[PDB]
Structure formats: C-alpha cells, structure tokens
C-alpha cells in the first residue's frame, strides 16, 4: 500500500497518447468522383447531414 | 484503409437512398487533409513555383 | 521543364503532395470554360491577362 | 497571392495581428472618396499615384 502508491503513480497513458497523436491527423474533407474536382452532392449531404 | 471503408459506407449509404449511380460509383473515394509537416513559406514557394 | 523542355503532364505526378487522381482532374479540368478558370489560366502577376 | 490568384479579401484574415473587425472596418472604407484615401490607394513608391 506504500510501493502499489508508487505504482500507481508511474502509470501513464502511453497507449493513449500514441492513438490520440494517429486519431488527430485522420480527417476527411471531401467525397469527388474520378476526374471531378467537385464533391458528389448526394453521398456528400449525406455525409455532412449525419454530422 | 479507412477510405476504403469510408468509400464503402458512403456508396452503400447511397444505394439506401436510391442513387443507383452513387451506388456502384467503386471510382469515386473520399479525400483527406494533407498531414504533411511543412512550413507554410516553402509549401506556397513550392506551389507557387510549380 | 524551364531548361530541358520536358513535359510538365509528366513532372506534375513527381511532384510530392500530388496524386495521380489529383493529377486525371487536373488533366480533365484544365481548360474549362469557366471565368475563374480561364482568369486562373492567364493569370499574370499584376491581375488576369489574356483576352 | 501573386502566383495562385487567391483572393486577397480572404487572406486578409490569415495575416497576424488583423481581427475579423478590422478585416470588416478595412471593407467598409475601402474605396471612400477622402483624397488621403485615394492617395494611399493609388500610392506608387515615388508619390501618389492614379488620378
């Protein structure tokens, strides 16, 4: 109960850190057909009206 | 991988709500954000030059 | 593309950032008939140029 | 700017130590009819310039 304390203490979210660093830079911003630079409305409304 | 999947969500989504052509659009695929670490002066050189 | 006079079709997928879909709706949208478009095309310096 | 044609109203905002407000202030007084405005409008490096 003195040493499990320390323990304890030298836990820290590592694991975590690494998954929030990877969650961080995975972003999408836009649904375009092949050779279009406009985004498809249809799947792209869809996607925005579910937020 | 996760456009893949996204790709997949986004088309069958699509087949819900009709959309016969969003549907088997497979060429169609999400775009994501550049994750590139570069300054903002040698990334517009760099554009602006090309 | 300035000295040897390669094609610059060709240099654009080398160029890091850019892929070979971005590149097809490069390739597909170049020469739209759209006024932003076409002032893009023809941008000199000091504001749009040609006609 | 220069070499992409951006729209230079929308890089206004990005630049450090310029607000929203005074992006909005710097729209609204833009083309006032004041001579000093004018003149600073029109200033070429050796004096005003335009009309």
């Known amino acids: 109960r003195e040493k499990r304390?320390?323990?304890?203490?030298?836990?820290?979210?590592?694991?975590?850190?690494?998954?929030?660093?990877?969650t961080q830079?995975?972003?999408?911003?836009?649904?375009?057909?092949?050779?279009?630079?406009?985004?498809?409305?249809?799947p792209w409304q869809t996607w925005n009206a579910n937020k | 991988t996760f456009g893949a999947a996204h790709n997949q969500v986004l088309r069958l989504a699509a087949h819900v709500?009709?959309?016969?052509?969003?549907?088997?659009?497979?060429?169609?695929?999400?775009?994501?954000?550049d994750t590139s670490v570069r300054s903002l002066?040698?990334?517009?050189?760099?554009?602006?030059?090309? | 593309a300035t000295m040897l006079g390669m094609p610059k079709e060709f240099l654009w997928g080398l160029i890091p950032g850019i892929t070979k879909t971005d590149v097809e709706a490069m390739r597909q949208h170049f020469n739209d008939d759209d006024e932003m478009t076409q002032m893009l095309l023809w941008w000199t310096p000091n504001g749009p140029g040609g006609e």
């Open chain 1, 5 to 22: 304390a320390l323990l304890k203490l030298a836990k820290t979210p590592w694991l975590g850190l690494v998954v929030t660093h990877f």
């Open chain 1, 25 to 42: 830079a995975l972003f999408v911003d836009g649904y375009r057909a092949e050779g279009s630079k406009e985004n498809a409305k249809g």
């Open chain 2, 41 to 50: 002066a040698q990334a517009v050189d760099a554009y602006g030059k090309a």
């Open chain 2, 17 to 33: 709500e009709g959309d016969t052509e969003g549907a088997r659009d497979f060429t169609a695929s999400v775009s994501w954000q």
